Amino acid sequence: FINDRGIKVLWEEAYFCPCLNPDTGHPRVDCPRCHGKGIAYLPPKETIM
Amino acid sequence: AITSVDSYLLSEIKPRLNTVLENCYIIDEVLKDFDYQTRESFKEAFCGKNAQHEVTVGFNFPKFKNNYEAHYLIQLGQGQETKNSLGSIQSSYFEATGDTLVESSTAIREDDKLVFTVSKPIGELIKVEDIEFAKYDNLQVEGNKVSFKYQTNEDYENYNANIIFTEKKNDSKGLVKGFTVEEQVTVVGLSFNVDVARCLDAVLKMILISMRDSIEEQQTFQLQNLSFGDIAPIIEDGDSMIFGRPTIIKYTSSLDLDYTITQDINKLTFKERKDWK
Ligand SMILES: [Zn+2]
User: Entry's Pfam families (chain B) (predicted)?
Assistant: First the structure.
């Protein structure tokens, strides 16, 4: 039922990026692993939702 | 004149912001008190000629999306009239004078005078930089030129100077009528990164300190006074919050009009008339 009704999506899993400032606790705005969001993402996974 | 503090601030902040951001050691000095990683990340992202991100400045209520990574929002505030003159006479003039200007110029020889040429008719000369003339020097101003005796001054035949002066509109009499207003403008550095908001606050305070010496707000917009708000989420229900710290800039300035007087009197005349009663 879900495979019939859902649309194909790419799912990628959140984790906090280890670029957070050890004092201020905020992300580095130049970080390449996360583009200023505090959250980095694992490689994408194909799923239907 | 009538004045528009918001447009002044936009015009003044934008070039100054650009010229600081293109100059790495200025930011390195401004941010010396911040955490090392905050400083280096800001300098890497926004600073220097190779900077891939950019800051932006503009008024509030645009119809388009802004650069919410770093954006100075300018926001015209309250004001009130504070001091009035007797008769509302702010000043009087014999010759309608425009804005104050400073221009670079060089001397040239002409007919055994030195002259400086200026782009506009000189309504009043305030200062020729680094020169004080004696009466012997026969200082004269005419049209858009300043002229200066050659005889004793031949060593200066190509001397480079800055002229501080003011335009003239026209040869007319009048009264400058008006009053003083105290007026507020708010500025906020929006960023979705809190450390960027804090750095934009520091940069803006530096810019305003530097601005206090400018001719614009030395002659007008006097008594700059700064107040600072809390850092808070400006918008809270996106995929992320947007933060900012407001600052309020308050200025005292004159609002006035040139009431020209057409009446002129150039001769009294006297007559005696006899009363035979
Ligand atoms: Zn990161």
Answer: SP10_terminator (PF23932)
